Design a protein around this ligand. Sequence first.
Ligand SMILES: CCCCCCCC/C=C\CCCCCCCCCCCCCC(=O)N[C@@H](CO[C@H]1O[C@H](CO)[C@H](O)[C@H](O)[C@H]1O)[C@H](O)[C@H](O)CCCCCCCCCCCCCC
Ligand SMILES: *[C@@H]1O[C@H](CO[C@@H]2O[C@@H](C)[C@@H](O)[C@@H](O)[C@@H]2O)[C@@H](O[C@@H]2O[C@H](CO)[C@@H](O[C@@H]3O[C@H](CO)[C@@H](O)[C@H](O)[C@@H]3O)[C@H](O)[C@H]2NC(C)=O)[C@H](O)[C@H]1NC(C)=O
Ligand SMILES: *[C@@H]1O[C@H](CO[C@@H]2O[C@@H](C)[C@@H](O)[C@@H](O)[C@@H]2O)[C@@H](O[C@@H]2O[C@H](CO)[C@@H](O)[C@H](O)[C@H]2NC(C)=O)[C@H](O)[C@H]1NC(C)=O
Ligand SMILES: *[C@@H]1O[C@H](CO)[C@@H](O[C@@H]2O[C@H](CO)[C@@H](O)[C@H](O)[C@H]2NC(C)=O)[C@H](O)[C@H]1NC(C)=O
Lengths: 242, 98, 273, 200
Amino acid sequence: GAVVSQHPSRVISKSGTSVKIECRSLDFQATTMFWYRQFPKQSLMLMATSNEGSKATYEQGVEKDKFLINHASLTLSTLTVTSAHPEDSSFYICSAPGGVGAFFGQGTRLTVVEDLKNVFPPEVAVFEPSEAEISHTQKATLVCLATGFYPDHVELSWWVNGKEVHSGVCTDPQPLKEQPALNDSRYALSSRLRVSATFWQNPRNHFRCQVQFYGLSENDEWTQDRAKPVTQIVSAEAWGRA
Amino acid sequence: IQRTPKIQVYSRHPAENGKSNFLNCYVSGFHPSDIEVDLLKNGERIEKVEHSDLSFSKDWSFYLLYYTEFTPTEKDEYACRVNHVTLSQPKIVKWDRD
Amino acid sequence: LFPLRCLQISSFANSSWTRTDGLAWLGELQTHSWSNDSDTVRSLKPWSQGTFSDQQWETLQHIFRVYRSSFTRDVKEFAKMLRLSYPLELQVSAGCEVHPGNASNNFFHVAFQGKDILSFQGTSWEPTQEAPLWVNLAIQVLNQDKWTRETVQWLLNGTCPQFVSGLLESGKSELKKQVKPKAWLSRGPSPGPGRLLLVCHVSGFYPKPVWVKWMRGEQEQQGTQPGDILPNADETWYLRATLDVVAGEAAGLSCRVKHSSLEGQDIVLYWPR
Amino acid sequence: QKVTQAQSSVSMPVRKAVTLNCLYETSWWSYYIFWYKQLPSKEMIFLIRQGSDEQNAKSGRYSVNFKKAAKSVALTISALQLEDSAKYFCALGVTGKLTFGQGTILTVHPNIQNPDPAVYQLRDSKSSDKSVCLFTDFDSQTNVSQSKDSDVYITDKCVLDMRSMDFKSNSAVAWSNKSDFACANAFNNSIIPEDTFFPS
Ligand SMILES: CCCCCCCC/C=C\CCCCCCCCCCCCCC(=O)N[C@@H](CO[C@H]1O[C@H](CO)[C@H](O)[C@H](O)[C@H]1O)[C@H](O)[C@H](O)CCCCCCCCCCCCCC
Ligand SMILES: *[C@@H]1O[C@H](CO[C@@H]2O[C@@H](C)[C@@H](O)[C@@H](O)[C@@H]2O)[C@@H](O[C@@H]2O[C@H](CO)[C@@H](O[C@@H]3O[C@H](CO)[C@@H](O)[C@H](O)[C@@H]3O)[C@H](O)[C@H]2NC(C)=O)[C@H](O)[C@H]1NC(C)=O
Ligand SMILES: *[C@@H]1O[C@H](CO[C@@H]2O[C@@H](C)[C@@H](O)[C@@H](O)[C@@H]2O)[C@@H](O[C@@H]2O[C@H](CO)[C@@H](O)[C@H](O)[C@H]2NC(C)=O)[C@H](O)[C@H]1NC(C)=O
Ligand SMILES: *[C@@H]1O[C@H](CO)[C@@H](O[C@@H]2O[C@H](CO)[C@@H](O)[C@H](O)[C@H]2NC(C)=O)[C@H](O)[C@H]1NC(C)=O
């Protein structure tokens, strides 16, 4: 298990606001924490070193005032992304030297949006199996579509008769852009659940596609007429068919 | 309170009256490290006294070199005063040019 | 021979007052010092960094800064749990000797109150032959910290040889340097009735190896009583060689000095007639 | 201190073995090399470590071919399973300060012994305007093409494992709001229609 915890795991912020990320050592004292940044489809770049007592060491080519590091105690290092802009939207991961080399935290998925109006929760729909597929293969494939959400901060899962299932499931690793041209483009995501035709043919069998959306917090400012796009679960369901 | 300091007082050059010289005080073989060393001119301690960084031998005992710029003059007495936890009273070792 | 010796003196008056001071010796030369009140190493020579890059050098400094804090917290916790009474004195002697002829040997020795208690042997901590029972309790805990063990091993078996090799290169001239001694005679306090104490002083020689003997022609006097080789502030040495004789028998006696700095020309000082 | 991973992507079938190359540069005489995989969650998973003064490392299905003189630290993953598909990072580090290479994406492909490529029309949702098509049971060698029309959405190929039946299958999904959209036309940039099952 992990011995370094990062908080938060996900954060949506408005441009010009300073974001605070915490890195905690669990049941060990750490006198150093390394902070890395990873841009999408890129590698982990070492940003800075957090030191107890002394100031932070920044790596060559890093902007020192963009990131405020502070080794608060022997179990806590904070990274402040001062006045964040969409260009600072990245993945920040800390580590603490130890074990066989270093212990990594789970990382922080940071998305900076110019306007909170661009944050939308997903719309979830389930498309029942084709009878043609059942006859041809004796298997039933369910498809779930999570659409029109922003940002891409979603966790899709399948629940059969109240329990999460992992066998016969495939979810897209990356979400499609609804408008590939447009900058504040909504995302779409698909998943498949494949069961035996006899399991699907039992009408007492319940199927649910659940989408965990990570959105706005309680502290955030909302002025629009529609509901505040908060962290929520959006589901769609289906019953087996005789 | 384990080992008592050996105190050795000597010159960098042959003592020739009037000519400026260096009075050395080598305090060695002591333990623990807490030590108070002073170089004296007729009993009063010298203010411009310098010293090496505290080091230690293979047997773990400590050693320091205390040095001062001085001009040897006849009728003038130079000494080393060392205070250690293993000492009954500060031990004074006078300088003899011979 | 030029072994590297890294030395640490840690004093603990109580659990709230402590002081750690370190130094490094390449042979007889002191190359580094690091006081308790500094966040950085003080390089005492212009070649003290060796062949290490500015980046490698900041890494080694970071490691010591972390080590120094960690050593302090650890000793305090061992003293608390093992019911060890203050004041405490801990000493560390670590380093290596680069041998072009063979491989390289390293060491990491720890002392508590002026006595050996443990050392780093291969990839783990070993207690000294006759060490108190609490030392085996501390060894168990220390050996549980595998990452520190791998780091001590990386420093002793990889970084120390790389550091020593570079210091030996960048320091070539200062290590091969020759300073000539100047000798003088004196008459010490009388060691008997009609007896004389013949004193021969030799000061300002470098390197440390020297040969000083009282002679009568080519006949070496076995009565020569050498003193300790004592240091000078300018990194040279001092040596006093005595001879207890009859007052009459002093005439014809000579003090003869052999030193590597001499150009095939030993110092010969005759006792004045 | 530099780590180079020249391979951007590697594809290999299940049960075979793959080699991920890594070249490095370091001014230290002694150091450690590490191999990590990054999960789709972006979590870093330690795989294996190699010491510069150690024998070739081996930890289960992971092995390293450490060539000190050439400064190369390749990783071999033997008896490849679908769960090995990830982005693999090589790193060099002393005292926990790790520097990572560019990374290599490994895609482990299933072995489809009995392919039955087909295109199916899924049942519409009462609460969606979308129509969905499923391209399924095709060979791992088939590349699924992105759509030409901006109002048609096509996912990349995905693999699912029906563990209890030892059955693995590939699938891609197509969807649209458009009335022009039919399953018969949807995946035609990826298939030979005469080699694919289309129900009546
Ligand atoms: C090298 C210096 C560079 C400068 C060179 C030039 C100038 C030379 C001047 C002075 C040097 C003289 C000192 C002698 C050399 C000693 C340096 C060895 C450094 C080894 C670092 C080990 C990692 C560490 O720090 N380890 C720490 C922290 O570890 C925690 O944090 C780590 C990440 O930071 C990891 O997560 C790790 O898993 C976790 O436990 C240990 O607590 C501690 O130091 C053990 C003490 C080691 C010495 C053992 C001796 C035992 C004495 C105690 C006896 C009982 C006391 C009874 C009262
Ligand atoms: C923890 O220990 C410190 C330091 O102790 C000192 O250092 C050691 C290595 C030994 O040399 C000790 O002899 C020495 O005390 C304690 O601080 C010290 O407290 C004493 C009071 O007992 C102070 O001494 C006084 O100093 C003034 C002048 O400043 C004189 O007028 C007095 O006659 C008296 O000598 C001193 O301020 C202080 N010393 C230092 C170096 O800080 C500390 O109190 C102790 N902590 C606990 C909780 O016991
Ligand atoms: C400790 O180190 C020795 C020597 O290693 C060399 O010196 C280093 C500082 C660095 O320059 C390295 O590149 C060198 O390897 C080790 O002994 C060597 O072991 C290797 C096996 O990897 C072998 O090929 C060599 O012949 C050995 N060399 C000598 C001089 O004996 C030794 O393994 C190390 N000890 C441990 C247990 O880590
Ligand atoms: C030796 O060094 C340490 C520094 O690491 C000193 O301890 C600190 O002193 C500061 C003074 O600003 C205090 O605020 C802290 O309580 C101490 N911090 C730590 C980390 O210990 C120490 O006092 C020095 N020792 C002496 C007596 O010379």
